[PDB]
Amino acid sequence: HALYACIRCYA
């Protein structure tokens, strides 16, 4: 939703 959120998600 938040690109910071996004990255976490694939991290």
Numbering used by the authors: 2 to 12
Q: What did the authors write?
A:
Herein we report the first X-ray crystal structures of mixed chirality α-helices in short peptides comprising only natural residues as the example of a stapled bicyclic and a linear membrane disruptive amphiphilic antimicrobial peptide (AMP) containing seven l- and four d-residues, as complexes of fucosylated analogs with the bacterial lectin LecB. The mixed chirality α-helices are superimposable onto the homochiral α-helices and form under similar conditions as shown by CD spectra and MD simulations but non-hemolytic and resistant to proteolysis. While previous reports of similar mixed chirality AMPs concluded on either unordered conformations or helical conformations appearing in a membrane environment based on deconvolution of FTIR spectra, here we reported X-ray crystallographic evidence of short mixed chirality helices consisting of only natural residues existing as helix bundles within the protein environment of a lectin and almost perfectly superimposable with their parent homochiral α-helices. These direct observations unequivocally demonstrate that the α-helical fold with only natural residues can sometimes tolerate multiple stereochemical inversions without significant conformational changes.
In all four individually resolved homochiral bicyclic structures, the peptides were present in almost perfectly superimposable conformations featuring nine of the eleven residues forming two full turns of a right-handed α-helix including the pair of stapling cysteines (ESI†). The two N-terminal residues and the N-terminal toluoyl double staple formed a turn conformation. In all four cases the α-helical fold resulted in an amphiphilic arrangement of hydrophobic and cationic residues corresponding to the helix-wheel model and explaining the membrane disruptive activities discussed above. Remarkably, the ten crystallographically non-equivalent stapled bicyclic α-helices observed in the X-ray structures of the homochiral rac-bp65 and bp70, and the mixed chirality bp71·LecB complex were essentially superimposable, with RMSD < 0.6 Å for the peptide backbones.
